[PDB]
Design a protein around this ligand. Sequence first.
Ligand SMILES: CC(C)(COP(=O)(O)OP(=O)(O)OC[C@H]1O[C@@H](n2cnc3c(N)ncnc32)[C@H](O)[C@@H]1OP(=O)(O)O)[C@@H](O)C(=O)NCCC(=O)NCCSC(=O)C[C@@](O)(CC(=O)O)C(=O)O
Ligand SMILES: CC(C)(COP(=O)(O)OP(=O)(O)OC[C@H]1O[C@@H](n2cnc3c(N)ncnc32)[C@H](O)[C@@H]1OP(=O)(O)O)[C@@H](O)C(=O)NCCC(=O)NCCS
Ligand SMILES: Nc1ncnc2c1ncn2[C@@H]1O[C@H](COP(=O)(O)OP(=O)(O)O)[C@@H](O)[C@H]1O
Lengths: 89, 1032, 178
Amino acid sequence: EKITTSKKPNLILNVAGLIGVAFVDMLRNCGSFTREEADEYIDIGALNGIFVLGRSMGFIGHYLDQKRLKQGLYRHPWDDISYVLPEHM
Amino acid sequence: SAKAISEQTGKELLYKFICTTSAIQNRFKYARVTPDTDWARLLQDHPWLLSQNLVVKPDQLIKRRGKLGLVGVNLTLDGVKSWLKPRLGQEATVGKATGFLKNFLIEPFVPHSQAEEFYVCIYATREGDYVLFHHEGGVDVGDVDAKAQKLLVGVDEKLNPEDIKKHLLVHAPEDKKEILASFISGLFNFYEDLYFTYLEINPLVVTKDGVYVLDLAAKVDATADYICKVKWGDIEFPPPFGREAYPEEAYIADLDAKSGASLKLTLLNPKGRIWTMVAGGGASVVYSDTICDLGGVNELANYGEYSGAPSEQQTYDYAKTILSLMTREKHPDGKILIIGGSIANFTNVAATFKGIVRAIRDYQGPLKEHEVTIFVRRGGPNYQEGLRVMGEVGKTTGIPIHVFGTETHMTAIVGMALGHRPIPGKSTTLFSRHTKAIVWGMQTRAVQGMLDFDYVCSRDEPSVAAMVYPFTGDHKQKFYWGHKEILIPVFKNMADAMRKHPEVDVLINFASLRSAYDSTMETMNYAQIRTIAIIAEGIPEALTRKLIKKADQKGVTIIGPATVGGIKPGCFKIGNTGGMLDNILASKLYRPGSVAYVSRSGGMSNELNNIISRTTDGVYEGVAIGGDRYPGSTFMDHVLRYQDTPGVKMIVVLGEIGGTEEYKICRGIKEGRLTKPIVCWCIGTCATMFSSEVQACANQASETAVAKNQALKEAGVFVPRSFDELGEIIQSVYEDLVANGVIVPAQEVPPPTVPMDYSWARELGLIRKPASFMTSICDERGQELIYAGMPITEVFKEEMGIGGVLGLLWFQKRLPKYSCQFIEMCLMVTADHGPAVSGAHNTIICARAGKDLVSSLTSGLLTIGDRFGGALDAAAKMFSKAFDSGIIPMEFVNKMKKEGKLIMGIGHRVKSINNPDMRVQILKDYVRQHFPATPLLDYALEVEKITTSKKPNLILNVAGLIGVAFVDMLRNCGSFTREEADEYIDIGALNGIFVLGRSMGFIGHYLDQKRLKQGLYRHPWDDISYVLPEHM
Amino acid sequence: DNILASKLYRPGSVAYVSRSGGMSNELNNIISRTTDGVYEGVAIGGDRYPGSTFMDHVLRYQDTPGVKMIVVLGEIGGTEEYKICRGIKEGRLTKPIVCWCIGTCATMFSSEVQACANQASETAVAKNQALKEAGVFVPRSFDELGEIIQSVYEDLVANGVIVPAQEVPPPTVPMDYS
Ligand SMILES: CC(C)(COP(=O)(O)OP(=O)(O)OC[C@H]1O[C@@H](n2cnc3c(N)ncnc32)[C@H](O)[C@@H]1OP(=O)(O)O)[C@@H](O)C(=O)NCCC(=O)NCCSC(=O)C[C@@](O)(CC(=O)O)C(=O)O
Ligand SMILES: CC(C)(COP(=O)(O)OP(=O)(O)OC[C@H]1O[C@@H](n2cnc3c(N)ncnc32)[C@H](O)[C@@H]1OP(=O)(O)O)[C@@H](O)C(=O)NCCC(=O)NCCS
Ligand SMILES: Nc1ncnc2c1ncn2[C@@H]1O[C@H](COP(=O)(O)OP(=O)(O)O)[C@@H](O)[C@H]1O
């Protein structure tokens, strides 16, 4: 990210990249896992589970927010949709 | 550009990186001496200088220092330490300027004579590198350009031995000729691979012992820092001789290096009144020149500009720096801030304008006591608000304001401020109406502007045929032709773009300074492309040499790098040239005119668009060649291209300091190559009348602005006295050509209208749209992530956890620490309950079917409902319904018994009495010892005491305990009212608690099944009871 | 559109009081196009006894330094104009005042309904004469008010009491997306 920020200032380490690299380091260096175990957990989708469990809280918060604001049934505006249908087929 | 480096850096890179057969002693042998260093450290870590004699030199970029007497020869160490008393620590005036002396250099003295002293230099030029050798070294060199032997090495080639043997070194002793034949070749290779621009050894001593270097003059390509990062280490770029730079000037320099936007500032004397912080480099030059034209020769103080589309923070910091400088003096006559700028092409005027207005909003105190008034004249993208909100910002703050726009002269503000004005085979045709271009890089706004300009010009087809973006696959991107949708193809690779579009003649290169060179070389390999526009700035001059040579030997014209491009009204537009459609319509650039111009700056090109539009029938073609040392095309090329063009009738040129290109115009009009009227003006007349000008690289008096102006004036070129009446002469020449009948002006024809982009109209506050969605939990538009009114840093610094963030996101409340800990405990106890339950079973089945984590966890979660996982919410609901009514626990039990309905939250397979459920015990103990009041918990506990007499195992299980304790937490933590707590229970907050808790267990089950490598599951047939109809 | 046409987005120096609402817009237009602007313009409603009479708001304008000129429109019926003249006789009102009274038709028409004039000394012509030789610049009719009003403005910029502030563009109201 030093190199990329030298290319362009906003090319910084994301939350995603930081969490990924720090999680790989935590698996490889906390002393609880062998190298193959850490690689196995990275492969099978431990970080997918981390993101899913984190964002489940936000999604449930959004559900409770929409329920508490009494928001009605949503229908997308026709102006935001581009209908390109075949003429005869 | 090219910046000079200190002798230490040049010598260190020479010693470390030279590759020649010659023996080079004194390697790694020098001593940088400063008044602020410990002499014991230098004489201990570096004691090698004790053995021999010593030479002491000044080390702050002084030329011809031998004549000034600061060169010490044959001094012993004690004599050296004593020699610094009467010179160091005070001024040292040479020529006209003066400065301090606080860093000198120390060398080992060497015995030598004139027979061994040689002069060598290598310096850059458009055609390659001039290498000069001179026989007599020392202070007797005098003229070197016309005295030393001349040799030229071309662009991208090596030096053969023969040129050094019998064309460069023919006035030297034979053996020393042989040794130099390799030493100079090694020096040239060191010149090439280190990206030097000027490399001077004066003098060079060659001896059987080896080679000796005494003074080194090195100017290096700064823009090549990205390619020579390892080769340079930590290089230093010393400022020139004069007063030391202020700390705020160093801050501005650091800001310039922060991003790609240009930010220049220089000071002469902060005691002046006339202060200027306009936008645009060439524009800054023009305003500064106009200040000193009509009575500001010595009163002007600052010299600076901002460009490259500086962001909010760049102009933020620049405005506060100029304001901090603004207050530290008191001028009895008064003070004025004069800020102009031409019509910006791409710099978002709105953002920089917000920066300056908000920097004056918060900084109001120390401005009104100095009697400062502001004269502002700005144009460009979104200038309407730039002439609007300052109108009341300066009115409410209490400063006299004078804000004008494009209709007024760019230069009239200067006269107004001082009272002088009352306050009111290359081709000659590159672009046609049917030319098409390929844009390299993903520039949606630039291509959309191109298309809009094409539409208002009544072009048959859009001028953008294809886009090249390496980082995505081939696809097609939507764009707007007037009001309708069209698709422009975007390709991963350029070969396909050129293969599938053979009609493309132009390529606009939006590649960065690191990818522009390779892209242009790949382009010039394709013969259909006749014109290439290079937008990037910061390409090192050597790479530009190679581009220029390839283009010349391929016959392809290059619109030089570091340019906005050029515009041919009615036919074609390069990228962001001419601003957006507002300027295009304002300057009438949708129809051909009769005046063709050429300039370096891209902002002055847009100002020329304005001037020619309002003083002439318009512009026929305008080209900005870029502000680099070696533009891909020069002034003379485009002047010839215009002269050979029948449609062009007037030439306009904006020259610059340095370079003999306007002189090429002079001989072009001397012998009769150029016949059309030519109005040229060279900017930078303050170079010969200021202390020092950085923004070029003039060497003698034959490259300044006034010399060019006179050499063009008495040659046949209508040269104004200044930029004040350049437009007047354009008017005069245009009228002279109209009266003579050579040009007939065509009457105006309305252009086609273009619907305004919704995003751009939203940035001007012209459209209202209702919001279809409401959110309350998280705001992420701003700089900082906000969790229900609380920044993420505030969330983390007060030691919140999962529970606190959960409270913020679900309830928008600041729960007390015990409530957050209780929520976390509830998530812990409900995390998992084995694989036998319905949800875990479904998750395991879906995981063994090979599905991903989301699908498996989802399939498990979808069984959470009434029969599985709903006991928490049901228990809380029914216990709350009973407690809210006045019925006592005994009556509640009897009532539930009567309706044939079991009490949710009561019952356990095991854990009857004296062996209680342990999760219940932990949670109950925590709620006892931390909660302030637990009424519903006591009600449920009385119900449990009643039910554990009907049957020992009818205990308050974890679901009922969590439900009643959560209701108690909502009703008694103090962050909720009664109706809010009831509403959150009603909408299913406890459903969310259980789902979030059990999601961890389901993900754990998925990971477990993946790790165990369990195969696809099929339920055994013996476990299924098949009862089918006979034949129904 | 009317606010921008009459440039009613910025403070001015002129204030007027009347009952009818249409004339309020018309007089805003006339003043804004022949004078630096309107500091305040009010309509009190053409009823028998409006909540606030002319003199209440005229004295309010007199007490506020922001108002420099008073412009008044009269009407048939009521002795309000004569009471205003009585107030201005002794010097209670010192700032320049221009007033025109409409309703001369009640003196030269068969019958007028749109009020309730009683004597010939109360009708529009008598009120106009009283205001004319009572210190108030009264033209013959609505026709030429322009050069009567703007003139007063160039009077007070000749005296230097009013400093003209040039216009500053206002933020524009966005229009409906649909
Ligand atoms: C050319 C450029 C767009 C620069 O290009 P950019 O760097 O922005 O875009 P990129 O190509 O993406 O470069 C980033 C590199 O990081 C890589 N990267 C991206 N994401 C990555 C990831 N996630 N991971 C890893 N890498 C990643 C990417 O691959 C690339 O790598 P690389 O190619 O190897 O370098 C721009 O700067 C420029 O020059 N002109 C702009 C347009 C123009 O016409 N202006 C002229 C206006 S006249 C003027 O100024 C005067 C005045 O002001 C006057 C007044 O105001 O008075 C006025 O208005 O007229
Ligand atoms: C299709 C394919 C799986 C056949 O597998 P197979 O081992 O021959 O047969 P099955 O996988 O059904 O299992 C074999 C036995 O399990 C039994 N069985 C199947 N489901 C059962 C259940 N729920 N309970 C108890 N027994 C079961 C079958 O009756 C069969 O009985 P058998 O032991 O008398 O032969 C194998 O040829 C293959 O993998 N081919 C690839 C093509 C493919 O994937 N097709 C998709 C199938 S539509
Ligand atoms: N190491 C040295 N020993 C003796 N004389 C030196 C040494 N270095 C420079 N000089 C003196 O400097 C003069 C040459 O100056 P030069 O190095 O070419 O430029 P500058 O004057 O800028 O240093 C010679 O006359 C020589 O006497």
